[PDB]
Amino acid sequence: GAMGSMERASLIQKAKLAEQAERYEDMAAFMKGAVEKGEELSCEERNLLSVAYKNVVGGQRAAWRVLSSIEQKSNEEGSEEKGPEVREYREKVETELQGVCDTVLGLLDSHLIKEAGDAESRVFYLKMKGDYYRYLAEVATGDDKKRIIDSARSAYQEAMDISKKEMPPTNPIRLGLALNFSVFHYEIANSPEEAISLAKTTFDEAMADLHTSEDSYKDSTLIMQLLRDNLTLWT
């Protein structure tokens, strides 16, 4: 409810409880409140913020996809009598999804991106901005779609530029960014050539430095496997 007066440490503790309870909407709200306390986030805290909102929007995206498929199948069949209910319900889910994306983008703009000290956290938040514009782009139509795509591209490119200057090629944040930007190219921007070349370069450059911390090894190698899987799917 009224989180402005709540102890920041209490909001983080409650976000962790909500995570254990698989209450991701609550978790997200707690982390929004924590962000709004106005301090920078730690690593753990970025992870909580990310997990919470990705679970919420993940659910909405999955539901949207089901409904869109039913809508399209219905319309294609073209029966004089079916279609209005699924359209309206798809629009309801879509509106809710857009609302969550707008919340995340608002927090990034109002609190997180400007206030980040270090390059690593700046890249993480710019990546997140790219991702939530990408989720808006999945459901956008027409001219709004073009603007949204441009916004995603701009955020990702800025992140990429920083990451190449400031972070090693095996850094999990740099890897996750490159993976997601390649997905943007393929799925959103209809640029398969760019997707494939970014994914291949990312994979190869990470492999070349793989011999250098065990603390990041599991995360980095998991992203490299997803790059490989995408490359197999795309070729």
């Binding site: 992870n47 990310s50 997990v51 990705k54 679970n55 991702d131 999990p172 890897l175 996750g176 993976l179 997601n180 390649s182 997905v183 393929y186 799925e187 995360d219 998991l222 992203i223 997803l226 899987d229 995408n230 799917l233 795309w234």
Partner: peptide
Amino acid sequence: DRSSSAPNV
């Protein structure tokens, strides 16, 4: 399949 993006760690 859809492409895979970065998961939850």
